[PDB]
Amino acid sequence: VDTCSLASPASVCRTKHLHLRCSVDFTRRTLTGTAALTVQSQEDNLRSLVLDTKDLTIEKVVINGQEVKYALGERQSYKGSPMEISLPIALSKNQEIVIEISFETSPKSSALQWLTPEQTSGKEHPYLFSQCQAIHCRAILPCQDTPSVKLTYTAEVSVPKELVALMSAIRDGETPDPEDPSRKIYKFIQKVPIPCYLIALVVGALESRQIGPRTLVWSEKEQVEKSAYEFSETESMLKIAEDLGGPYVWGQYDLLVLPPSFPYGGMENPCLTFVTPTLLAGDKSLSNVIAHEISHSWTGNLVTNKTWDHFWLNEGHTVYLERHICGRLFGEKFRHFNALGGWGELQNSVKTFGETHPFTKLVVDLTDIDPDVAYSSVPYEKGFALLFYLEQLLGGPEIFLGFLKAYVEKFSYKSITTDDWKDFLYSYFKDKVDVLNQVDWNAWLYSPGLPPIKPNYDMTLTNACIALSQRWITAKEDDLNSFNATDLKDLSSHQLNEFLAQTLQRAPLPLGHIKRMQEVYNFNAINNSEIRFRWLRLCIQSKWEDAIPLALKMATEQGRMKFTRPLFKDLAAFDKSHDQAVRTYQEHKASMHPVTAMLVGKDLKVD
Numbered sequence: 001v002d003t004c005s006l007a008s009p010a011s012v013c014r015t016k017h018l019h020l021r022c023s024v025d026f027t028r029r030t031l032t033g034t035a036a037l038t039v040q041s042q043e044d045n046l047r048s049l050v051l052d053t054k055d056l057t058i059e060k061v062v063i064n065g066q067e068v069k070y071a072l073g074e075r076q077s078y079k080g081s082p083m084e085i086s087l088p089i090a091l092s093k094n095q096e097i098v099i100e101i102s103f104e105t106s107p108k109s110s111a112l113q114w115l116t117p118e119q120t121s122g123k124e125h126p127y128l129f130s131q132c133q134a135i136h137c138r139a140i141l142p143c144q145d146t147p148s149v150k151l152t153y154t155a156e157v158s159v160p161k162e163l164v165a166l167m168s169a170i171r172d173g174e175t176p177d178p179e180d181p182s183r184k185i186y187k188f189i190q191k192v193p194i195p196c197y198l199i200a201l202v203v204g205a206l207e208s209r210q211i212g213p214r215t216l217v218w219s220e221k222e223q224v225e226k227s228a229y230e231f232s233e234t235e236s237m238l239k240i241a242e243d244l245g246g247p248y249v250w251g252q253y254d255l256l257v258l259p260p261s262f263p264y265g266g267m268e269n270p271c272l273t274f275v276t277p278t279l280l281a282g283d284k285s286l287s288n289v290i291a292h293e294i295s296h297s298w299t300g301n302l303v304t305n306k307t308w309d310h311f312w313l314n315e316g317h318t319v320y321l322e323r324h325i326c327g328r329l330f331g332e333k334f335r336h337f338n339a340l341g342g343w344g345e346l347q348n349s350v351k352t353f354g355e356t357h358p359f360t361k362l363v364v365d366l367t368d369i370d371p372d373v374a375y376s377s378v379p380y381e382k383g384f385a386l387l388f389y390l391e392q393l394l395g396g397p398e399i400f401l402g403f404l405k406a407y408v409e410k411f412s413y414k415s416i417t418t419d420d421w422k423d424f425l426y427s428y429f430k431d432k433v434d435v436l437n438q439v440d441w442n443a444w445l446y447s448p449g450l451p452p453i454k455p456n457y458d459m460t461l462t463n464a465c466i467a468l469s470q471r472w473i474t475a476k477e478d479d480l481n482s483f484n485a486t487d488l489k490d491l492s493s494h495q496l497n498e499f500l501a502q503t504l505q506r507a508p509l510p511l512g513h514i515k516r517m518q519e520v521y522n523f524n525a526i527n528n529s530e531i532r533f534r535w536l537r538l539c540i541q542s543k544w545e546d547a548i549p550l551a552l553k554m555a556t557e558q559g560r561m562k563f564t565r566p567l568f569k570d571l572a573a574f575d576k577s578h579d580q581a582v583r584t585y586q587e588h589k590a591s592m593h594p595v596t597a598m599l600v601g602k603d604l605k606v607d
C-alpha cells in the first residue's frame, strides 16, 4: 500500500504512457494543457479510477471523444486532492484506454519554481524548473503519483521562442507554435518506463556544450564554460558505472546546472540530471555528486523503490555505487575515507532527530508524514552502512559488486520493497546464509538510531583530519600561537572539509579559537560550498558575530537545502542573529523555492 498516494493502486489499474501537451505561461505562472494517460485495467469490470492532484484546475476529462464525469475530493494536506473519474464503459482486465485530462497548474505548485529575470544569471529572461521527487508530480499533472507505477511518455511543450525547454527524455525536435508564432514547441520522448517522480521540465535561456560522447552540459550562458570543466569526469564515471551496473539504457546522459535556488545537490532525472551550481568549486572536488546521480541510472531509475518507505533501496545502493566510482578513480583509500565521513554524517542526523526518532529507521513508515519533512541523510548513510557491512561480511567489494550487478539485472524496470531485496540477497548468497543469519535484521531495518554494528574503515586519509581537529579542541589560549598555515599543507580540500566536520561535531569551540583559525587558515576566503558551509556553521555556533552576514548571505544567495536549512537554524539559535534570521526568511520567502520556504518556515517556527 502506498500511503503517500491517493490514486488507484497498481493492483487496480496502471498508467502505461503519458502524452503531455502543455504551454508554459510565464505571465500567469501556469502550465496549461492536456495529460493523456493510457491506463490499463488490472481488474474485471472497472468503472472508475482515482488520480492524485495538488492545486490543479481541471477543465475537463475526455474519453472516446466525449466529456465524462469526474470529482475532486477534499484536500488532504500535503497529499493534494483525489480526482475520481467515471469511465464511460466498464473495462475488462488488461483493457487499455486513453484518458485526456485538460488542466492548469497553480502558481504555487509545490513542484515548480518560477523565476523572474532578476533571479537568473542573464537578467533578461525568466526561468522555470520542476522537482517532482518525492510526491510533487501531482502538482504538475494528474497521475498515479506513486513509484509503484512505471510509464513511458512523450511531450510537446510550448514556450516563448527565445527560451529553451528540456525534459527527462530524449529531445525530439522543435518547431514554431502554429497557434502563436512568438512561441516554440519542443518535443520529447522517453521510451524507457519510469516512475512519475522522474518527470522533469526546465524552461529558460539555456545553452549547451558537449563534454563527452553522450553528454551535453546545459546552463545559462554565463555558467557553461565553468560547468563543462567542473564535470569533465562524467564520461569516465559513466564507463565505470556501466562496468559495475551493466549497460546504460537511457541513450543520453546530459547535465543541467540550475539556478542557485535548486533545493538539492542533484536529481537523477533520466537523460538529464539536474545539479546545483554550488558544485562549481573550480577543481572538480564535489564530483561525487555526479557519480551519485549517474549511479541512479541503475539503482533508482531501473530498479525503483515501490513506495517511499523503501527509499533507502534507492539511496543506499546509489551511495554504494557512488563510492565505488570514486574508489576506481581515486583509490580504495579514498572510498574508505568517504565511507567513514558518511558515518559521521549519519551520527549527525541521528543526533539531530534523536536516537529513538522514527525518521532514523532505515525503512520508515510515511503514513501521515510529509516525505519532505522526513528527508535526511539517514536513508543514504544508514543504507550505505548496511551494504558496506554486508560487503565486509560476505567476502569483500568484488563479491558484493557481483551481487549488486545481479540485483540490478533481476529487478530492472520493476518497483520493489525491502523484502524483495532481502529475498534476493539471501537467494544470491545461499552458500553464505549462515553469515546472513548473524545479521540483526530487525535492528538494521526497523530500529531507530545508529546501526547496531559499525563497519571497518581504513583510516589513512582520515587520521590527519582527526589529529588536527583534536589539536584545536584540546588547545588552550597559550597553544593558539602554535597553529600556522603550514598545518593545512598536505590536506586536500576533502580533508579540510573532514577536519571542519570533525571540529563541528564538538561545536561550540571558544570564540578566541575560531578567530585564530580564521587568522592562520583564512577559511573566509574559501569558496568551496561544502567547506564554507561547515566553516560558517562552526563560526555561528561558536558565537562569532562577524560571521553573521557571511552566514546570512550564503543562506540566501543559494538555496540548496543541505546548506540553507542548517545555516538558518544556526542563525536562529544564536541570539545576536535570531531576529535577522527571521527577518531575512520573511523577506525572501515569496521568492524562495516552495518546499525550501516551507521547511525553513517550520525550522524557524515562523508563520
Ligand SMILES: CN(CCCOc1ccc(Cc2ccccc2)cc1)CCC(=O)O
Pocket: 133, 134, 264, 266, 267, 268, 292, 293, 296, 308, 309, 310, 311, 312, 315, 364, 371, 372, 374, 375, 376, 378, 379
Ligand atoms: C533530489 N533528492 C530527492 C528529493 C526528495 O526525495 C525524497 C524521497 C523520499 C522521501 C521520504 C523519505 C525520507 C526519509 C527516509 C525514507 C523516505 C523524501 C524525499 C535526492 C536525489 C538523489 O538522491 O540523487
Ligand SMILES: [Yb+3]
Pocket: 172
Ligand atoms: Yb524523432
Ligand SMILES: [Yb+3]
Pocket: 423, 426, 427
Ligand atoms: Yb527466500
Ligand SMILES: [Yb+3]
Pocket: 476, 478, 479
Ligand atoms: Yb598551556
